[PDB]
Amino acid sequence: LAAGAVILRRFAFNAAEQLIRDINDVASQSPFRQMVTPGGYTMSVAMTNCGHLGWTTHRQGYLYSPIDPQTNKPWPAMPQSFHNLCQRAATAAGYPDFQPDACLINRYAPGAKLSLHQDKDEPDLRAPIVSVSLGLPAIFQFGGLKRNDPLKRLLLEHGDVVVWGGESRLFYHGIQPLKAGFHPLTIDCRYNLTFRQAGK
Ligand SMILES: O=C(O)CCC(=O)C(=O)O
Ligand SMILES: [Fe+2]
């Protein structure tokens, strides 16, 4: 896919049903919610987190917090299925010592999208991003270090795991508006799990 990046297609197929069961479990404690950007806009993607740290938005800036700002309780613990799959994927991608302390769970309803951005809220750039696709297919945009660099368009299907780090750790990327459809395991949406090492 790029220097330090790779797409392990269908890698998470065997663990998908369990992963989805655990997404529902996590959501039972920290419900999916559409966050508001520092600018004041409600995101189309609904999110929640599990693990020690969760990605959140603030009146002015993004940041990680061990506390869910909606429930005001800690985020749920990282499910075992999540931990195991992430580790295997990281190893297969060339990052054997990856130890995530945060997992951002994204839910894409039909038409939802995630505009081009960089995952630049994490201090340690040695840690890669492990991104798991579940359910409906989506078009993933993968660019470069500069906001205006050329973009590659890749279809991400159920079970696909994208991992980027090293030279591509800060590359711009996004998800185009989710096309309508149906999937046996997620029904009407696409879920994505983004594992990161947000702390030290
Ligand atoms: O849904 C995806 O495949 C991308 C999610 C993403 O870029 C993020 O959570 O930072
Ligand atoms: Fe991202």
UniProtKB/Swiss-Prot annotation:
Substrate binds at W55, Y62, L63, Y64, D121, R147. It comes from the Bacteria. GO terms for biological process: DNA alkylation repair; DNA repair; oxidative demethylation; oxidative RNA demethylation; response to methyl methanesulfonate; RNA repair. SUPFAM superfamilies: Clavaminate synthase-like (SSF51197). The keyword DNA damage applies. It is an enzyme of class 1 (oxidoreductase). 2-oxoglutarate binds at N106, R107, Y108, R190, Y191, N192, L193, T194, F195, R196. Its cofactor is Fe(2+). GO terms for cellular component: cytoplasm; cytosol. Fe cation binds at H117, D119, H173. InterPro entries: Alkb, AlkB-like, AlkB-like_sf, Oxoglu/Fe-dep_dioxygenase_dom. Changing W55A: Abolishes activity towards single-stranded DNA containing 1-methyladenine. Binds 1 Fe(2+) ion per subunit. It catalyses: a methylated nucleobase within DNA + 2-oxoglutarate + O2 = a nucleobase within DNA + formaldehyde + succinate + CO2. Its EC number is 1.14.11.33. Residues 99-199 form the Fe2OG dioxygenase domain. Belongs to the alkB family. Dioxygenase that repairs alkylated DNA and RNA containing 3-methylcytosine or 1-methyladenine by oxidative demethylation. Has highest activity towards 3-methylcytosine. Has lower activity towards alkylated DNA containing ethenoadenine, and no detectable activity towards 1-methylguanine or 3-methylthymine. Accepts double-stranded and single-stranded substrates. Requires molecular oxygen, alpha-ketoglutarate and iron. Provides extensive resistance to alkylating agents such as MMS and DMS (SN2 agents), but not to MMNG and MNU (SN1 agents). PANTHER family: ALKYLATED DNA REPAIR PROTEIN ALKB-RELATED (PTHR16557), NUCLEIC ACID DIOXYGENASE ALKBH1 (PTHR16557:SF2). This is Alpha-ketoglutarate-dependent dioxygenase AlkB.
